[PDB]
Amino acid sequence: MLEQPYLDLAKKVLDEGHFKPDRTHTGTYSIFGHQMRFDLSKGFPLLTTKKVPFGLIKSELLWFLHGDTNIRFLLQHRNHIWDEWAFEKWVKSDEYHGPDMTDFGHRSQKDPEFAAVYHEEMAKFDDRVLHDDAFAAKYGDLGLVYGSQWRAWHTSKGDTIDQLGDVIEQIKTHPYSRRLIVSAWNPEDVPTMALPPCHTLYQFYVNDGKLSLQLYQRSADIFLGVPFNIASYALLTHLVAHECGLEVGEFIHTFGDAHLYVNHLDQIKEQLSRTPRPAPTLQLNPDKHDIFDFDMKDIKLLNYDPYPAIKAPVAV
């Protein structure tokens, strides 16, 4: 059944995982070095044992393919995955005349009244990124985020490199290259980044007419994050393959520190008693070929029948 590598990765951390402290005041069960492999010709590896919001994945990947780093687009697409990073920047600066708000995400966990104070402050900031252009330009732009690492890597000489654009031209003219790599890790910037990229690097490969992609993810949250992560990069492999007139082959997910937070152990156990169902089919618009101009309506997910969502706390 296609999602079995995930169930086996999760069962495996459950049984071999060494406890490890981490960042958040919440510990983890961790393993280092793991690789799973998904044959994208048998289906689209969106999980059927819990509901994953495919709309969120889809608009986030498009924001990256457009080389965009401003939250105004995700918000227009009802997507709020990157909000708090933008919000954090608002609250550490000069027009933020407002309530106590530092340590806010953790505080919301065991929040006083504070949770609706944070959540209406947040709804303020967001409405404003949507409607005040100059605000959006200043507190809505996250800067160094996947869209710019992938499509506007800044050089020493003050210019910008479109890593991804170029690798697509390389797949087109030189399919057999072993240099079809894109990277989000920049030595210069990760010293003072909020979150250095978890999806550090990925490599493309063409053989027998099929395109495959291998991702190196330095760090992964098995429960909350990996279901999204598998789906963003399986989507990218379909998208780049379409654009190059290639067939899809495998997605290979390689892990550095794969971890399960200590407050997610019941929910993963919960999920591990579900039987997988047949995999959804991805359908891509036949008329459009430039993936940089794909649009939500051009990506169709067919026949997805998940088990109910499982809710779990974001550990901080």
CB 139 within 8 A of CB 91: no
First to last CA, the chain: 33
60 sits near ligand UMP (criterion: CB under 6 A): no
Q: For ligand UMP, which is the closer residue by CB, 55 or 225?
A: 225
Report the amino acid identity of residue 32: F
Among 99-107, 175-183, 260-268, 307-315, the segment contacting a second copy (CB under 8 A): 175-183
Which residues, numbered 35-94, are part of the site for a second copy (CB under 8 A)?
Answer: 35, 37
CB 300 within 8 A of CB 283: yes
Beta strand 210-221 pairing with 247-261: parallel
Contact partner at residue 221 from a second copy, ligand UMP, none, CB < 5 to 8 Å by partner kind: ligand UMP
Which residues, numbered 108-137, are part of the site for ligand UMP (CB under 6 A)?
Answer: none
C-alpha span between 80 and 70 (Å, rounded): 12
C-alpha span between 57 and 246 (Å, rounded): 23
Closest CA to 163 of 141, 174, 147: 147
Taking the CB of residue 247, how many other CB atoms lie within 10 A of it? 15
CB of 154 to a second copy, least distance (A): 6
Q: What's the residue count for the chain?
A: 316
Which residues, numbered 161-180, are part of the site for ligand UMP (CB under 6 A)?
Answer: 178-179
C-alpha span between 234 and 248 (Å, rounded): 9
- Vertex 65 angle, CA 314 and 198, to 5°: 35
231 sits near ligand UMP (criterion: CB under 6 A): no
**The residue to which tokens 């401003």 are assigned:** 70
CB of 54 to a second copy, least distance (A): 25
123 sits near a second copy (criterion: CB under 8 A): no
State the binding string over 187-226 for ligand UMP (x if CB under 6 A, else -).
--------x--x--------------------xxx--xxx
Q: Residue of minimal CB distance from ligand UMP?
A: 225
Q: Give bridge partners of residue 100 from the DSSP assignment.
A: none
In angstroms, what is the C-alpha Rg of the chain? 20
> How many Cα atoms sit within 13 Å of 195 on the Cβ side?
16
Is residue 273 marked as binding?
no
CB of 55 to a second copy, least distance (A): 29
25 sits near ligand UMP (criterion: CB under 6 A): no
Question: What is the token pair recorded at 133?
Answer: 């252009």
Q: At what angle do helices 226-244 and 4-16 cross, to 10 degrees?
A: 150
12 sits near a second copy (criterion: CB under 8 A): no
How many residues make contact with ligand UMP (CB under 6 A)?
12
188 sits near a second copy (criterion: CB under 8 A): yes
Detail the residues annotated as belonging to a binding site. Answer: 23, 178-179, 218-221, 229, 259-261, 315
- Residue ranges for the known binding site for dUMP are 23, 178-179, 218-221, 229, 259-261
Positions that interact with a second copy (CB under 8 A): 18, 20-22, 30, 32-35, 37, 153-156, 158, 161, 163, 176, 178-179, 181, 183, 185, 187-188, 190-191, 196, 200-201, 203, 205, 207-208, 212, 214, 216, 218-219, 250, 252, 254, 256-257
Instruction: Give the residues lining the site for ligand UMP (CB under 6 A).
Output: 23, 178-179, 195, 198, 219-221, 224-226, 229
